[PDB]
């Protein structure tokens, strides 16, 4: 069954780095693209960035260039990296599947969610 | 069984209607391009 | 040129259909900037309702019906007694990135 998994410890103190990973089944990274969304407590969801299906990354313009996202074609894993956190960055982060090939061009599935808290 | 939507110049672009003409498809032939 | 808004208020008695409109900063939205509708369960559950500014998502019931009803993007759900208690977000594709709507709370009866 098509399904999205994402895992990580989440608990972070200010000014250090933690990374989150999204692991996928039921589909290939070649036929789809992956986008990440973020859910702070009680506030609306915001778009983080997208990895294209066959190479090439995109990031939110206002989001710092001091961060990177990474993926695994063979074993179907994706990794998001934040190299320095600040107390406004506490939020729940979600991975999501985007099918721009398909007739349903928009994002099809979303991650199961991870809590990321500061202190 | 008739519903009328009032249209006025004050009514906004969304509220105001825009004329729609639909063309459905030998006698009606396109121009024949002629060179020199 | 980045404002995204929703009424954030919805309440429909069963049997009557309602339209909720999400309005961008470019006036009437075109399909060129793709419109998306997503639904939030109170358990942080997400699903896709509408895509492509006219196309319903796969796996969401046809009772969900979203089109470019107004000048701006809109969504229409026929009244349901139980399963419509959720949050709804509108999404618009700017040339560079995605913008997500504020969210609308539906409380039937």
């Amino acid at each position: 069954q098509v399904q999205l998994k994402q895992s990580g410890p989440g608990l972070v103190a200010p000014s250090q780095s933690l990374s989150i990973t999204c692991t996928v089944s039921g589909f290939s990274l070649i036929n789809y693209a992956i986008s990440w969304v973020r859910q702070p407590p009680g506030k609306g969801l915001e778009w983080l960035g997208v990895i294209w299906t066959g190479g090439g990354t995109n990031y939110n313009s206002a989001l710092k260039s001091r961060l990177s996202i990474s993926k695994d074609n063979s074993k179907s894993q994706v990794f998001l990296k934040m190299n320095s956190l600040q107390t406004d960055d506490t939020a729940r982060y979600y991975c999501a599947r985007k099918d721009y090939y398909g007739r349903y061009y928009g994002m099809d599935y979303w991650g199961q969610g991870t809590s990321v808290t500061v202190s | 069984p008739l519903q009328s939507y009032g249209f006025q110049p004050t009514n906004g672009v969304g509220y105001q209607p825009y004329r729609v003409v639909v063309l459905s498809f030998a006698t009606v032939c396109g121009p024949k391009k002629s060179t020199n | 040129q980045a404002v995204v808004t929703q009424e954030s208020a919805l309440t429909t008695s069963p049997g009557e259909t309602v339209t909720l409109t999400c309005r961008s900063s470019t006036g009437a939205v075109t399909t060129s900037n793709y419109a998306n509708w997503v639904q939030e369960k109170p358990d942080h559950l997400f699903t896709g309702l509408i895509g492509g500014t006219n196309n319903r998502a796969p796996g969401v019931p046809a009772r969900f019906s979203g089109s470019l009803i107004g000048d701006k993007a809109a969504l229409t759900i026929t009244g349901a007694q139980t399963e419509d208690e959720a949050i709804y977000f509108c999404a618009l594709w700017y040339n560079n990135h995605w913008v997500f709507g504020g969210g609308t709370k539906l409380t039937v009866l």
Side-chain angles (χ1 to χ4, degrees), chain A, chain B residues 1 6 9 12 14 17 26 29-31 34-36, chain C:
Chain A
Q1 50 89 30
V2 62
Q3 183 210 325
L4 278 294
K5 180 66 173 66
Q6 47 176 73
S7 56
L11 287 76
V12 193
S15 292
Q16 81 252 25
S17 165
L18 190 140
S19 174
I20 193 67
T21 181
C22 173
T23 300
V24 309
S25 74
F27 51 85
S28 50
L29 274 77
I30 296 296
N31 290 341
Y32 303 85
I34 294 294
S35 309
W36 285 72
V37 298
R38 171 171 68 101
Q39 173 59 70
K43 285 186 300 307
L45 82 168
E46 66 275 16
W47 175 92
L48 306 185
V50 55
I51 177 71
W52 287 136
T53 194
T57 60
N58 299 66
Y59 299 99
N60 201 357
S61 167
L63 197 61
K64 83 189 82 193
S65 79
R66 219 184 63 248
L67 65 88
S68 58
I69 183 175
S70 51
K71 66 162 174 321
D72 181 344
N73 293 114
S74 69
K75 304 189 293 301
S76 307
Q77 283 177 0
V78 184
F79 308 100
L80 188 153
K81 180 68 174 66
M82 279 307 291
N83 57 11
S84 200
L85 261 57
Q86 47 98 24
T87 187
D88 301 3
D89 301 335
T90 176
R92 291 184 66 92
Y93 292 63
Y94 293 75
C95 78
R97 180 182 94 153
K98 196 194 71 94
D99 186 7
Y100 68 84
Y101 297 164
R103 63 73 181 170
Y104 173 54
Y105 282 70
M107 291 125 287
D108 191 0
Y109 284 106
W110 285 271
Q112 62 85 30
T114 178
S115 180
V116 177
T117 64
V118 60
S119 291
Chain B
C29 293
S34 80
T35 79
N36 195 346
Chain C
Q1 203 72 252
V3 62
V4 59
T5 186
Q6 267 187 21
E7 288 80 15
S8 80
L10 182 57
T11 285
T12 180
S13 295
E16 66 96 14
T17 62
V18 290
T19 300
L20 76 164
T21 76
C22 51
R23 292 94 69 202
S24 76
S25 169
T26 182
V29 301
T30 317
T31 313
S32 76
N33 296 328
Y34 285 69
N36 293 297
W37 286 99
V38 311
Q39 192 168 187
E40 179 143 339
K41 207 56 63 171
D43 308 84
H44 289 172
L45 188 153
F46 287 66
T47 186
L49 303 168
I50 301 299
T53 307
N54 279 268
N55 304 115
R56 205 184 300 114
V60 55
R63 183 168 83 261
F64 262 99
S65 279
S67 181
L68 198 147
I69 295 99
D71 278 24
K72 274 72 71 181
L75 178 64
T76 66
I77 188 64
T78 311
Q81 192 273 329
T82 313
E83 72 271 28
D84 283 343
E85 284 279 359
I87 307 297
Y88 301 83
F89 311 82
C90 180
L92 198 63
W93 173 250
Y94 307 150
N95 46 6
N96 52 5
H97 55 241
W98 280 104
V99 67
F100 289 100
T104 300
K105 172 48 173 93
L106 171 45
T107 305
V108 289
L109 67 91

